[PDB]
Every structure is written in structure tokens, then in C-alpha cells.
Design a protein around this motif. Structure first.
Motif, PDB file in Angstrom:
ATOM      1  N   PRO A 287       0.889  -1.160   0.000  1.00 11.56           N
ATOM      2  CA  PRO A 287       0.000   0.000   0.000  1.00 11.56           C
ATOM      3  C   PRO A 287       0.926   1.208   0.000  1.00 11.56           C
ATOM      4  O   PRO A 287       1.352   1.655   1.066  1.00 11.56           O
ATOM      5  CB  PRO A 287      -0.864  -0.087   1.260  1.00 11.56           C
ATOM      6  N   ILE A 288       1.240   1.709  -1.204  1.00 11.07           N
ATOM      7  CA  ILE A 288       2.443   2.509  -1.402  1.00 11.07           C
ATOM      8  C   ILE A 288       2.437   3.808  -0.586  1.00 11.07           C
ATOM      9  O   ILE A 288       3.463   4.205  -0.049  1.00 11.07           O
ATOM     10  CB  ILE A 288       2.731   2.742  -2.899  1.00 11.07           C
ATOM     11  N   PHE A 289       1.270   4.418  -0.409  1.00 13.42           N
ATOM     12  CA  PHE A 289       1.151   5.730   0.212  1.00 13.42           C
ATOM     13  C   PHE A 289       1.310   5.656   1.730  1.00 13.42           C
ATOM     14  O   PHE A 289       1.352   6.691   2.387  1.00 13.42           O
ATOM     15  CB  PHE A 289      -0.199   6.321  -0.205  1.00 13.42           C
ATOM     16  N   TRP A 290       1.452   4.460   2.318  1.00 15.24           N
ATOM     17  CA  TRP A 290       1.761   4.399   3.746  1.00 15.24           C
ATOM     18  C   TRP A 290       3.238   4.112   4.021  1.00 15.24           C
ATOM     19  O   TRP A 290       3.708   4.289   5.142  1.00 15.24           O
ATOM     20  CB  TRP A 290       0.864   3.380   4.469  1.00 15.24           C
ATOM     21  N   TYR A 291       3.968   3.671   2.991  1.00 12.63           N
ATOM     22  CA  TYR A 291       5.316   3.155   3.170  1.00 12.63           C
ATOM     23  C   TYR A 291       6.344   4.271   3.037  1.00 12.63           C
ATOM     24  O   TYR A 291       6.284   5.104   2.130  1.00 12.63           O
ATOM     25  CB  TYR A 291       5.564   2.029   2.163  1.00 12.63           C
ATOM     26  N   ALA A 292       7.309   4.248   3.964  1.00 15.19           N
ATOM     27  CA  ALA A 292       8.525   5.024   3.860  1.00 15.19           C
ATOM     28  C   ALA A 292       9.206   4.801   2.509  1.00 15.19           C
ATOM     29  O   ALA A 292       9.087   3.746   1.898  1.00 15.19           O
ATOM     30  CB  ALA A 292       9.449   4.676   4.984  1.00 15.19           C
ATOM     31  N   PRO A 293       9.956   5.814   2.026  1.00 15.88           N
ATOM     32  CA  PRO A 293      10.601   5.738   0.715  1.00 15.88           C
ATOM     33  C   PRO A 293      11.636   4.615   0.625  1.00 15.88           C
ATOM     34  O   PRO A 293      11.783   4.030  -0.443  1.00 15.88           O
ATOM     35  CB  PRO A 293      11.227   7.138   0.538  1.00 15.88           C
ATOM     36  N   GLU A 294      12.353   4.350   1.720  1.00 16.92           N
ATOM     37  CA  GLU A 294      13.350   3.277   1.710  1.00 16.92           C
ATOM     38  C   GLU A 294      12.705   1.888   1.658  1.00 16.92           C
ATOM     39  O   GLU A 294      13.370   0.904   1.317  1.00 16.92           O
ATOM     40  CB  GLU A 294      14.318   3.431   2.886  1.00 16.92           C
ATOM     41  N   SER A 295      11.415   1.788   2.043  1.00 18.06           N
ATOM     42  CA  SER A 295      10.700   0.539   1.963  1.00 18.06           C
ATOM     43  C   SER A 295      10.319   0.331   0.496  1.00 18.06           C
ATOM     44  O   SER A 295      10.468  -0.756  -0.051  1.00 18.06           O
ATOM     45  CB  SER A 295       9.460   0.543   2.882  1.00 18.06           C
ATOM     46  N   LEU A 296       9.888   1.417  -0.153  1.00 18.09           N
ATOM     47  CA  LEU A 296       9.415   1.381  -1.524  1.00 18.09           C
ATOM     48  C   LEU A 296      10.600   1.096  -2.444  1.00 18.09           C
ATOM     49  O   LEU A 296      10.456   0.429  -3.466  1.00 18.09           O
ATOM     50  CB  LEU A 296       8.762   2.720  -1.861  1.00 18.09           C
TER      51      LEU A 296
ATOM     52  N   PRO B 282       3.914   5.412 -14.142  1.00 20.47           N
ATOM     53  CA  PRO B 282       3.596   4.490 -13.052  1.00 20.47           C
ATOM     54  C   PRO B 282       3.571   5.268 -11.742  1.00 20.47           C
ATOM     55  O   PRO B 282       4.379   6.167 -11.513  1.00 20.47           O
ATOM     56  CB  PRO B 282       4.689   3.412 -13.066  1.00 20.47           C
ATOM     57  N   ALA B 283       2.603   4.920 -10.903  1.00 15.85           N
ATOM     58  CA  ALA B 283       2.424   5.556  -9.609  1.00 15.85           C
ATOM     59  C   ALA B 283       3.703   5.484  -8.780  1.00 15.85           C
ATOM     60  O   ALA B 283       4.156   6.493  -8.260  1.00 15.85           O
ATOM     61  CB  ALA B 283       1.284   4.891  -8.876  1.00 15.85           C
ATOM     62  N   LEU B 284       4.270   4.297  -8.601  1.00 16.57           N
ATOM     63  CA  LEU B 284       5.332   4.138  -7.614  1.00 16.57           C
ATOM     64  C   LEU B 284       6.551   4.965  -8.011  1.00 16.57           C
ATOM     65  O   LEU B 284       7.286   5.447  -7.148  1.00 16.57           O
ATOM     66  CB  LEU B 284       5.692   2.659  -7.471  1.00 16.57           C
ATOM     67  N   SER B 285       6.799   5.034  -9.328  1.00 18.11           N
ATOM     68  CA  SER B 285       7.881   5.825  -9.886  1.00 18.11           C
ATOM     69  C   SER B 285       7.678   7.290  -9.525  1.00 18.11           C
ATOM     70  O   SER B 285       8.530   7.913  -8.894  1.00 18.11           O
ATOM     71  CB  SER B 285       7.956   5.647 -11.381  1.00 18.11           C
ATOM     72  N   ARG B 286       6.491   7.802  -9.877  1.00 17.16           N
ATOM     73  CA  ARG B 286       6.184   9.213  -9.699  1.00 17.16           C
ATOM     74  C   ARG B 286       6.167   9.552  -8.215  1.00 17.16           C
ATOM     75  O   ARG B 286       6.590  10.635  -7.829  1.00 17.16           O
ATOM     76  CB  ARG B 286       4.837   9.582 -10.326  1.00 17.16           C
ATOM     77  N   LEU B 287       5.665   8.622  -7.386  1.00 15.77           N
ATOM     78  CA  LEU B 287       5.559   8.880  -5.957  1.00 15.77           C
ATOM     79  C   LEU B 287       6.964   9.046  -5.387  1.00 15.77           C
ATOM     80  O   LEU B 287       7.183   9.846  -4.470  1.00 15.77           O
ATOM     81  CB  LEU B 287       4.781   7.773  -5.242  1.00 15.77           C
ATOM     82  N   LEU B 288       7.903   8.222  -5.850  1.00 16.41           N
ATOM     83  CA  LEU B 288       9.245   8.264  -5.285  1.00 16.41           C
ATOM     84  C   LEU B 288       9.921   9.567  -5.716  1.00 16.41           C
ATOM     85  O   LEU B 288      10.720  10.103  -4.969  1.00 16.41           O
ATOM     86  CB  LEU B 288      10.082   7.047  -5.678  1.00 16.41           C
TER      87      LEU B 288
END
Ligand SMILES: O=S(=O)(F)c1cccc(-c2cn(C3CCCCC3)c3c2cnc2[nH]ccc23)c1
Ligand SMILES: NC(=O)Nc1ccccc1
Length: 258
Positions: free
Chosen positions: A151-160, A202-208
Motif C-alpha cells: 500500500p504505497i502511500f503508507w510506506y517510507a521511501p526506503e521501503s518502496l 507508473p504511480a510508484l515511480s512518480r511517488l518516489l
């Protein structure tokens, strides 16, 4: 153990003399192994962590089930969204303090909860919440303050990014929990909704990328300023700069007091 319905692996509502007079319980089963989960929850005794009640066996006695208290008031996320109209800032601070204190207890047992979010916090009553869902919880080695998984929006960046989890990745999460509380889990300003506005890929890319540039979730319009500051601390880029649960606890207690 008479099955009733699905609450959430999988968690099921069950009634435990044969006369349908028995108390209701929540029961977790799979369909690896939650031998770890059972051991962890059994050891934990805190007014702010869901209560272990025992074990039972699945079909053929080939399977374990985890028997816990059932809280019909359900998860904090749904409670907040239904009753936003009548829950004040003081009550949210009360919830925040309770959750913080359960997280402190976890931290002292070298336990990374990892899943912490308003959907797995339960309402025992209007003025009392408890942390649940220990399914991803993992104990830290005695000699090391993090672990790594395969659940990407709860995770710290180092987790992602690097698949690292620690007690400080939990702290990033608790920040996101504070945000859920003070937005009453409103869909219009959910972490995911805020994300979609923060790029008009992609979400995860943009989120990071957004996280790296220092973009964070905005203060909820009705949020006390001091609570917003706590959130931003919790979302410090480096793990080591986030405050501990122990350092947060006094602040929220100081805030709730007032
Ligand atoms: O029917 S629902 O509206 F979905 C509904 C209604 C009322 C309660 C729940 C509920 C959900 N879970 C879990 C917690 C988080 C992850 C899995 C789901 C409960 C609940 C109640 N007692 C519990 N005891 C231990 C866990 C637990 C769910
Ligand atoms: N922690 C935090 O602020 N995360 C975030 C930022 C932007 C969009 C969605 C989530």
C-alpha cells in the motif's frame, strides 16, 4: 467455532454448549505461516493492542486458528468516515496518543508492525482504540534494527525503494495515520487522491520522485498546527531523522492534555 462472516490471509467473525449462546470472536486463518503472528500477539499485553484469547484448530487439526477479541464497532477508518460530523479534535488526539503508546510497546519488543493504518486500528468503544493486524509484523534480530524482504502511500521511501523496514519505517506510517485521523479518512483528500492531484506514468515511480523532492501530504484544513508539524517530522527523508515513538508520545500527550 461457528462461522458467521468475513471481517477482512483472512479474518472471520465466529461464535464460539451448542446453544448459540456463546460469545463472538474474530478468527484468522490462511488459504509463510502465522506461527510467528500467534507468538507475537500472545506475548503482548497492552490496553492499546488487540487481545489474544487462544488458539483453536482448523479442519483435520492440520491448521491453527488465532482466537482474538471481536470489536463490532469495527475499524477506525470506517468509524471516522461515518461519524466525522460529531468527532472533535480532542477525540482525535486521544486516539493518536493511544496508538502512539501501543507503538512504543511494540518498539520495546523489537517488533516492526509494518501495516499500521486506520483500517487495522479497531474501535473498542467511542473513546478507546487498539492496534490490530499483526500479519506483516516481524521481530528485529537482537543485533540489527531493520530487515529486508524480497500500500504505497503508507510506506517510507526506503521501503518502496530498497525493501527496508524498521521501527522508523513504522514512524513514517504513524505520520500517515495522523493524517488519516485529521482528515477523518475523507476520500477527497486521501493519500491516493492527494497523489493524483500532485501530478494533474507508473504511480510508484512518480511517488518516489515527489517524495525525493520533499513534497509531502498537505495539512488537513481543520488540523491543529502542532499536529501537522509532527506529521512532517515523521516523514523526514532519512530514517534516522524521524523521531522515535517515544519522542512523539509526549508531544501528542501534551497536545491532548490541552
Ligand atoms: O464486516 S466489516 O464491516 F468488514 C467489520 C465489522 C466489524 C469489525 C470488523 C473487524 C475487522 N477486523 C480485522 C482488523 C484489521 C485486519 C483484518 C480485519 C477485526 C474486526 C473486528 N474484531 C477484530 N478482532 C481482531 C481483528 C478484528 C469488520
Ligand atoms: N508521506 C507522504 O506525504 N506521502 C505522500 C505524498 C504525496 C502523495 C501521497 C503520499
Amino acid at each position: 467455532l461457528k462461522y458467521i462472516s468475513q471481517l477482512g490471509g483472512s479474518v472471520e467473525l465466529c461464535r464460539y454448549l451448542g446453544d448459540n449462546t456463546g460469545a463472538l470472536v474474530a478468527v484468522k486463518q490462511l488459504q509463510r505461516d502465522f506461527q510467528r503472528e500467534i507468538q507475537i500477539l500472545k506475548a503482548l499485553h497492552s490496553d492499546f493492542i488487540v487481545k489474544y484469547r487462544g488458539v483453536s484448530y482448523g479442519p483435520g487439526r492440520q491448521s491453527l486458528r488465532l482466537v482474538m477479541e471481536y470489536l463490532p464497532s469495527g475499524c477506525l477508518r470506517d468509524f471516522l468516515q461515518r461519524h466525522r460530523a460529531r468527532l472533535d479534535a480532542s477525540r482525535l488526539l486521544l486516539y493518536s496518543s493511544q496508538i502512539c503508546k501501543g507503538m512504543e510497546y511494540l518498539g520495546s519488543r523489537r517488533c516492526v508492525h509494518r501495516a499500521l493504518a486506520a483500517r487495522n486500528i479497531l474501535v473498542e468503544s467511542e473513546a478507546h482504540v487498539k492496534i490490530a493486524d499483526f500479519g506483516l509484523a516481524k521481530l528485529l534480530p537482537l543485533d540489527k534494527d531493520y530487515y529486508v524482504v524480497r500500500p504505497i502511500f503508507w510506506y517510507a521511501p526506503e521501503s518502496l525503494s530498497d525493501n527496508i523496514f524498521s521501527r522508523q519505517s513504522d514512524v513514517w506510517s504513524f505520520g500517515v495515520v495522523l493524517y488519516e485521523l485529521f482528515t477523518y479518512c475523507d476520500k477527497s483528500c486521501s493519500p491516493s487522491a492527494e497523489f493524483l492531484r500532485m501530478m494533474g506514468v507508473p504511480a510508484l515511480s512518480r511517488l518516489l520522485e515527489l517524495l525525493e523532492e520533499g513534497q509531502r501530504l498537505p495539512a488537513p484544513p481543520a488540523c491543529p498546527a502542532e499536529v501537522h508539524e509532527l506529521m512532517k517530522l515523521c516523514w523526514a527523508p532519512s530514517p534516522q531523522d524521524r523521531p522515535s515513538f517515544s519522542a512523539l508520545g509526549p508531544q501528542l500527550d501534551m497536545l491532548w492534555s490541552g
